[PDB]
Amino acid sequence: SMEGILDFSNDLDIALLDQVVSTFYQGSGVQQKQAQEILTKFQDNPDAWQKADQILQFSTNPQSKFIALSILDKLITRKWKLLPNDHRIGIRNFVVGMIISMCQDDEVFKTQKNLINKSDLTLVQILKQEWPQNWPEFIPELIGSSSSSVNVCENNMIVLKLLSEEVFDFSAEQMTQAKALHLKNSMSKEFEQIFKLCFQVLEQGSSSSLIVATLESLLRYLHWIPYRYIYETNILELLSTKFMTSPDTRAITLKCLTEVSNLKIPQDNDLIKRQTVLFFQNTLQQIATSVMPVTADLKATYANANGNDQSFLQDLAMFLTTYLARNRALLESDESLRELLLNAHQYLIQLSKIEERELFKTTLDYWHNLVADLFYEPLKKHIYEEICSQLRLVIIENMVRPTIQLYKSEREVLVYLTHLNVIDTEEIMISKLARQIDGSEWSWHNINTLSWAIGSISGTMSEDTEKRFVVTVIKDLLGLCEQKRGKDNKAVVASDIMYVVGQYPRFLKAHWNFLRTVILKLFKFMHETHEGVQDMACDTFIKIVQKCKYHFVIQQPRESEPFIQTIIRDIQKTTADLQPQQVHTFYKACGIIISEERSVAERNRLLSDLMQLPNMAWDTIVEQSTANPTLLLDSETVKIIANIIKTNVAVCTSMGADFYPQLGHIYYNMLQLYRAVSSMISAQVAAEGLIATKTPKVRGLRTIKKEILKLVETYISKARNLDDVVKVLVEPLLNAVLEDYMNNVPDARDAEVLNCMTTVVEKVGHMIPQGVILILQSVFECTLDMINKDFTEYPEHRVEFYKLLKVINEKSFAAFLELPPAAFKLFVDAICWAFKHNNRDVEVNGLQIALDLVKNIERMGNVPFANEFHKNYFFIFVSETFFVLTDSDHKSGFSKQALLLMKLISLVYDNKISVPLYQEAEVPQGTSNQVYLSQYLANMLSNAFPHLTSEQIASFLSALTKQCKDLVVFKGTLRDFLVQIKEVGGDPTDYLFA
Amino acid sequence: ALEALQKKLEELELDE
């Protein structure tokens, strides 16, 4: 029954409209749901705009008037120029003729602010179409009307505010360059009259509503107006004094002054410098006398969250940091300005204690700016010694676990502050440690934060000072753990001890007996059943090793063997209690040390001894699983194999090229294992169906294949002897994986195969051209069929597929030349298929492959394959690129679509395409490719966007082809085209902008 | 005080 108003044959039953509108806004359930759908079909009716006359005049529901203003807004925005001219006067008179009335009835002027604001915006949409060419007297008549009614004078401030935003703040993407410039110039030419009305309103008071709405409009003006309007009038003193006193105007005034601190002014006028000092002195005085003194506990205020205190403290931090980053030098030399400078920073100190992550980052950025300057600029740091001293404590007490981005910022500021005063930093940290020991501030969170702070300043003190500092800290931490009761407490303190120790490798390097003691403590902690201790001991072990590895590989004075040998000997008992992933980290740590041994025979010996346990377990399994493949039907056997390979991956990760001898020990049997596993998976899918791929049994089997491919990829990516990779590794690898991939059902194909192949082609692809051909033959057509029915299925295969085609196109392009013409056509189809993905990982590769393929064809010169390529696929690539540029669903790829299009267009306007791109029947002989390209593009655009005039398409194409050697201008012309297709009657001269 | 620090750490254990 609610679907009656959708019938435009009758007249609009406004009373029925206000019912369905209220059913939508105030109702619920199914009665609200379809009423919403009826309002969608009504609003989206192409003729609903002419019924907005009745709704805005007859309805009593303000939401209904709002909805119809939207219907109007779509009309003004997209079809205004198509209207009969008298309709444009009707709408324009109507809209001016309602705002006139809503401002006179004080009831509706304070009851329906949404509706008047929505009407103001509708008016601004008309001004963007008609003003000032067909409305030269808008601004003068706006000023005159303001003097009659306070309600209209305030609303005119709302109109000007929105106008400034539409023209200067939100135009770049929503209008053409030409139309934006026209509007900016028009506002600029008449701002003198706008400013006078704005200034006199602010000086003569007195309506708070009128004043605030004027200040809100001033905020927008400050984005673009010239500085003389601010510094050559008295407006700075009004903002920094009068309007800072009342809380109604306080927030907006503070935002205006923040924008003032960013104005473009001249830095050589000492008068302007004093005005910049003056408004800051006034603003800080008003804050100290009307809001809170510099000693106030801003942390407590912010946490109480009264009124708008949080937003005010946020704006104050923004104002102080913005001003001081630009102007603090104005306050640093004059002795009379020293208290102002230090009070402003003292407010920032108090602001920095607030418990508000995002606000802290804002102040932390300023502090970074300050302390970096005190570190490099002469004679500056003595001014801020007491500011800096407090900042040290604020940063130490708010240190986060090492967001990682925030920790880096805190560490950088704290390191600067330690250079500025090493002695003060040590005293603060030792004192905080004492308050941890006496228990006044003892807490798990508190001791961890301090350890992070202590660890963050590593390498900033002299080695001797560092030595006695570290010793004091470890000793006190050791005493703190000694006095604490319970495993929970003593695990936290022991972890912190390890964290700090791990953070100071310069100290560990110079004290081997201490370093040995640490490592043996870690090995002891690897038997600790308490949660997290084993993880901590492993993470500390590998961290210390990465920094002190040289001291494990050499034979230390006082001993018989490098400590690495001592670690390898006891490796079974050291790791016996660890989880497999922890054992893999341990082995990786050992691999780091071993790679430091540059005697080949000694390094290979360490490698083979480190690999003794996994090699023995490997040899037995390869024995018993070969005789005979039933043991792979054991879950326990599958885990042991996966864990053996992961160990090799871990060690290969840290050893790279050095890993080759160990790879050769297992390589040939590993690939055989890969085959055996591959058969068992295929068998299980045959016996149980596709669901077998979801079973634990098969997932454990595919894990083995995956780890094998990752091991091979890991070595080849880091190998140095490429010759051995080609002649020893690549061929057995391809025989083991290509055919097995091609001949499995889609659900049993591991996308890791494509990723492994990508690595091989990346590293040695230039050396195995028949290998690359075999890769394409085995994976191309079958993978393409998995992914060319939708954009959803097989996400990994999709990403790896185009990664693989990208590298093959880069490094062995000849493989695509050897494809049969039908297969080369699927290659082109597949590239364009990647254009249409909203997946960024597919789309960017698809566009890059296209660009790189065009370049590969260009480099071939004037030969039959390059000639046939343009005849077959040039306009396909121009058409498909244009399609994604203009469909509004691939905006993330605009830049690379533009680049590719310009390459395609420039090929023709330079005459590198030797063939004619046309059939010699459809166009006269001798016709250039440039003339045919314009004709083709004009027809394609005329059918794809029929609402455009021929003139628009021709002017657009003319500017586009002329600009195909200037990416920034070319992209500007594309953006202008993307705006004009959104509406009717776009000005074709707009394309002469550049 | 480096030799004392070494022994103090060797004595560190989690259990009472």
């Binding site: 879950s635 669901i691 979801k694 079973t695 634990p696 | -």
Partner: protein
């Protein structure tokens, strides 16, 4: 003299494990998560009936609340060695006791096995 300025207390915790709870959408042939958090075995002290109470992390909303009936049987899922599937006839996590086919997954096979033992050691108590 100076003047100076959940309805779970009546229960005991038999078992507590972290788990993710799934409900089967039969009309879509799809498993749907209902919650992640602590699964607790709660015996009432005044009836000794053991229940399943599970609340989502952070929001603390109940995603499972039902009696560990002795007729329920734990069946494995085809794609998991750390999950159990079973039908539940009266669960009052979201109002009225509705029937549900549940799946519950744990961090490891050990916890899944231990859960089954405790789930059976709870059907014994609700038999008497």
């Amino acid at each position: 003299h100076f003047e100076p300025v959940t309805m779970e207390e009546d229960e005991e915790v038999l078992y507590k494990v972290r788990a993710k709870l799934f409900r089967f959408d039969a009309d879509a042939k799809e498993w749907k998560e209902r919650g992640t958090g602590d699964c607790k075995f709660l015996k009432n002290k005044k009836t000794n009936k053991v229940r399943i109470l599970m609340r989502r992390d952070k929001t603390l909303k109940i995603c499972a609340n039902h009696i560990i009936a002795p007729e329920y049987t734990l069946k494995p899922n085809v794609g998991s060695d750390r999950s159990w599937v079973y039908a539940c006839t009266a669960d009052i996590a979201e109002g009225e006791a509705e029937a549900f086919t549940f799946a519950i997954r744990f961090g490891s096979k050990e916890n899944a096995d231990k859960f089954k033992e405790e789930f059976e050691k709870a059907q014994e108590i609700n038999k008497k």
